[PDB]
Symmetry: C2
Subunit: 89 residues, 2 copies
């Protein structure tokens, strides 16, 4: 396993009301910027992932534009949502 | 109360179900949704979630997007709300 333990913890269970910082790749800096833009719970970011039809490029660009995520942070966030959806959606 | 279409939707993960599997989304509404990019139920779930599950704003969005009447939007909201309570 090459994912983080934080990715593994997120994809292991339904997300419920978990905050946005529970997503892999979303540290405190990115999480605050997301919260300032209304994306305060992980499920709101899932919503954007789903509205973008789970498209990696669109989602990772959206994350970049919205909170300034770098390539690794956006890859990690995407992969965490992608694997959560494969498990639970 | 609820339709069997609702109960069937809320009973299981939606996976790749088409948008027409959502309660209230019939053939006419589904066509309009697909034309606008909402071809699978999970894309409408996405909009529901981006709107923070807000009933008024989601039902208004659905009316504006595909022409859903009050009953159709009520049925579609309720099926997404109950699905989220079970699986999200």
């Amino acid at each position: 396993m090459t994912t983080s333990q934080k990715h593994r913890d997120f994809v292991a269970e339904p997300m419920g009301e978990k905050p946005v910082g529970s997503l892999a790749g979303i540290g405190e800096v990115l999480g605050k910027k997301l919260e300032e833009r209304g994306f305060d719970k992980a499920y709101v970011v899932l919503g954007q992932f789903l509205v973008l039809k789970k498209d990696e490029d669109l989602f990772r660009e959206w994350l970049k534009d919205t909170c300034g995520a770098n390539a690794k942070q956006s890859r990690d966030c995407f992969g965490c949502l992608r694997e959560w959806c494969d498990a639970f959606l």
